[PDB]
């Protein structure tokens with residue numbers, strides 16, 4: 001599905017064009033060689049040329065496989081890594097680990113294997129690579145290639161860059177298009193916000209707050225921002241596409257009025273991880289309802305509609321009686337000062353609704369005014385049925401604690417205190433975050449689950465920042481554009497674009 005001339009668009013620039021990039025990019029190990037997807041691949045490719053560095057990459061890979069193995073197979077896996085990497089005369093022996101550190105972990109196998117056993121060793125490895133190996137890579141041709149990729153990442157994005165297919169949902173104050181990148185063939189979802197509506201409504205600050213919150217969070221369970229451009233009539237937001245429906249449709253139309261507890265377990269586990277990634281940026285969501293939980297092609301879920309999200313400054317509280325009738329925590333209803341607690345109250349509502357088939361404070365077959373449902377959220381205690389195990393009852397009651405100070409997860413521990421609840425006793429988060437627990441429902445691919453000033457010029461420049469670094473690099477990799485274009489010379493020789501003699 002790539003454009004006819006895609007190899008011309010993503011054609012590498014001559015390395016001489018990247019001198020300004022070379023002079024300004026910060027040379028941080030974690031960023032260049034790990035966080036940035038393409039940088040990490042280029043650094044690992046550099047270690048393949050050095051015979052002595054190959055073993056360190058293979059070792060860290062095998063440790064990544066160990067962390068995720070299930071407990072009934074860590075003994076044999078822990079042994080396999082020992083006799084291949086940590087024995088003295090091994091085929092691929094690691095030396096910078098230290099004979100004292102291997103002798104310390106060698107006898108740590110004698111005890112109940114830990115999922116994070118090799119954390120000490122792996123960190124000692126990163127210690128070594130941060131030093132000489134990293135500074136050599138900086139003076140290698142692979143880093144010159146990295147600069148070429150950054151030069152492309154930085155190119156301007158416009159209406160031409162994309163290709164709008166038929167609608168993909170709609171909104172009153174903002175359309176939702178399809179937008180596909182012509183050059184790579186990658187699908188997205190556009191959140192077109194026209195300028196005329198926002199200008200007169202005076203919400204420019206709330207459209208920026210949403211764009212920036214989406215830009216900073218990078219989670220497997222929240223919709224990610226990939227591009228932000230302005231067109232001749234609107235400001236656009238290119239986000240992750242979900243073609244699997246929303247959780248409300250699957251609770252009430254697809255499944256019984258509700259789900260099996262084990263199936264609600266899976267979705268709650270992913271939502272919790274989604275909320276945890278937002279809380280790392282000390283950003284609160286406050287819009288947690290079944291409709292905003294979306295399923296993708298594979299069956300996993302992401303949180304959507306961050307328009308009511310707000311980034312709390314560390315150590316401070318905010319006020320705001322916002323949200324949706326029936327999913328607002330008591331501290332929000334009372335217009336008090338709150339932090340992240342509204343999001344754990346929401347999680348309680350979602351787990352309950354998934355298991356029971358109705359809201360904890362409103363019956364599915366009940367007609368109640370918006371004044372009584374609120375009184376219930378503030379006064380009455382919810383009730384449970386035989387659909388809930390004792391574990392399920394517990395976590396819901398603790399999350400639905402009226403007093404936000406005794407509410408589960410609203411302590412100094414954070415989301416960790418929630419992953420520890422007996423409700424998730426049979427859940428292995430390491431494997432869930434690695435994405436190798438099969439979802440309980442897989443959507444069929446063929447399914448369909450449904451005028452100018454100057455003060456605006458400065459606001460538009462702050463919004464239309466262009467492509468987002470990590471999502472863009474991931475796109476290049478997924479579409480195999482990196483595999484095809486990332487071509488060096490025969491027998492480790494400098495290609496033309498990387499030779500400063502003849503441009």
Ligand SMILES: COC[C@H](C)NC(=O)c1c(C)[nH]c(/C=C2\C(=O)N=C3CC=C(C(=O)N[C@H](C)c4ccccc4)C=C32)c1C
Nearest residue numbers: 168171174189223240241242243244245305447448449450
């Ligand atoms: C293929 O059949 C499945 C059925 C027919 N369609 C869907 O499930 C299906 C499709 C195609 N797009 C979406 C929708 C999305 C998506 O995908 N990603 C995202 C990321 C972020 C939002 C988001 O913030 N919105 C808020 C409310 C908003 C506010 C104001 C204006 C516009 C939008 C929405 C989406 C959905 C569910």
